[PDB]
Write an enzyme that holds these catalytic residues in place. Structure first.
Site, PDB file in Angstrom:
ATOM      1  N   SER A  44       0.714  -1.798  -0.374  1.00  0.00           N
ATOM      2  CA  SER A  44       0.053   0.176   0.033  1.00  0.00           C
ATOM      3  C   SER A  44       0.906   1.506  -0.160  1.00  0.00           C
ATOM      4  CB  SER A  44      -0.556  -0.301   1.093  1.00  0.00           C
ATOM      5  OG  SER A  44      -2.002  -0.946   0.884  1.00  0.00           O
ATOM      6  N   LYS A  58      -0.104   3.226  -2.738  1.00  0.00           N
ATOM      7  CA  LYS A  58      -0.937   4.482  -3.279  1.00  0.00           C
ATOM      8  C   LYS A  58      -0.472   6.058  -2.949  1.00  0.00           C
ATOM      9  CE  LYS A  58      -3.754   1.527  -0.877  1.00  0.00           C
ATOM     10  NZ  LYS A  58      -4.222   0.283   0.854  1.00  0.00           N
ATOM     11  N   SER A  90      -5.320   3.989   4.398  1.00  0.00           N
ATOM     12  CA  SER A  90      -4.770   3.249   4.217  1.00  0.00           C
ATOM     13  C   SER A  90      -6.393   2.331   3.144  1.00  0.00           C
ATOM     14  CB  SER A  90      -3.830   2.583   4.113  1.00  0.00           C
ATOM     15  OG  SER A  90      -2.795   1.498   3.773  1.00  0.00           O
ATOM     16  N   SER A  92       1.542  -3.022   4.320  1.00  0.00           N
ATOM     17  CA  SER A  92       1.349  -4.472   4.684  1.00  0.00           C
ATOM     18  C   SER A  92       1.102  -5.335   3.773  1.00  0.00           C
ATOM     19  CB  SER A  92       1.197  -4.723   5.695  1.00  0.00           C
ATOM     20  OG  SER A  92       0.237  -4.398   6.314  1.00  0.00           O
TER      21      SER A  92
END
Length: 256
Positions: free
Chosen positions: A41, A44, A101, A208
């Site tokens: 992530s 992102k 996230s 993660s």
């Protein structure tokens, strides 16, 4: 410093990538910084920036409403679930993709852009030759060893994270918004932040995934000293390996 990173890695049972850029003199502390890691992530950051890039030329863009349907939710949607049947603006999805996230959010920004490949070309324009996104959430969190998909080097992300938040990657208003999204992150308390002095201000983005992959990229603003850009990636050889935010926190301690 290289020694302490070698030991922290051997004892940790995994593989550790680090790249600290010290913008005072552009000096680097590198460890496996040229090896590829699944981004999870932390990817992102790229999506949100790509949307911020669009807004530079398009002033109605950040306010655009976007519908959130119950068919849109995936496995992790802390913010997007609260707006089912209603709407969220792009600005809101980017905030939530970065601060919480949110996987639903990530997937609405990619889709608005028109595909993971649209985010790679944007990375290319910045001058990032390494960054590749290939899948949407959450499967871009598989992080299979040697799998090239959704990967990048610690260094490559440090140079582009520094450009995005402190350099030429975005016009000021956009660069400011991005940084205010990163600083307001809620997920990073146990990662890179835990290893620095508490009075230092940090923007970060965690990530993660499987193989106990555990990532945090970050811009650190010391109280009396030019900023630092740190990227700490980590991954293990066993698929059900427990994530290790504590290892990123320790590496952070060391290098800083």
């Amino acid at each position: 410093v290289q020694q302490q990173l070698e030991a922290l890695e051997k004892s940790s049972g995994g593989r550790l990538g680090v790249a600290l850029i010290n913008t005072a003199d552009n000096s680097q502390i590198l460890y496996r910084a040229d090896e590829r890691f699944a981004m999870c992530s932390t990817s992102k950051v790229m999506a949100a920036a790509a949307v911020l890039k669009q807004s530079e030329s398009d002033k109605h863009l950040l306010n655009q409403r976007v519908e959130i349907k119950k068919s849109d939710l995936v496995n992790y949607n802390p913010i997007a679930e609260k707006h089912v049947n209603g709407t969220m603006t792009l600005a809101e999805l980017g905030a939530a993709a970065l601060q919480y996230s949110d996987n639903t959010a990530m997937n609405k920004l990619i889709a608005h852009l028109g595909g993971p490949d649209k985010v790679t070309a944007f990375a290319r324009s910045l001058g990032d030759e390494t960054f590749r996104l290939d899948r949407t959430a959450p499967t871009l969190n598989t992080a299979i060893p040697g799998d090239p998909r959704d990967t990048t080097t610690p260094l490559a992300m440090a140079q582009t994270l520094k450009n995005l938040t402190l350099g030429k990657a975005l016009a000021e208003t956009q660069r400011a918004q991005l940084v205010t999204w990163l600083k307001g992150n809620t997920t990073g308390s146990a990662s890179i932040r835990a290893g620095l002095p508490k009075s230092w201000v940090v923007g970060d983005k965690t990530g993660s995934g499987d193989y106990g992959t555990t990532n945090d990229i970050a811009v650190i603003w010391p109280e009396n000293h030019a900023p630092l850009v740190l990227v700490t990636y980590f991954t293990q050889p066993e698929q059900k390996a427990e994530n290790r935010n504590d290892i990123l926190a320790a590496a952070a301690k060391i290098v800083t």
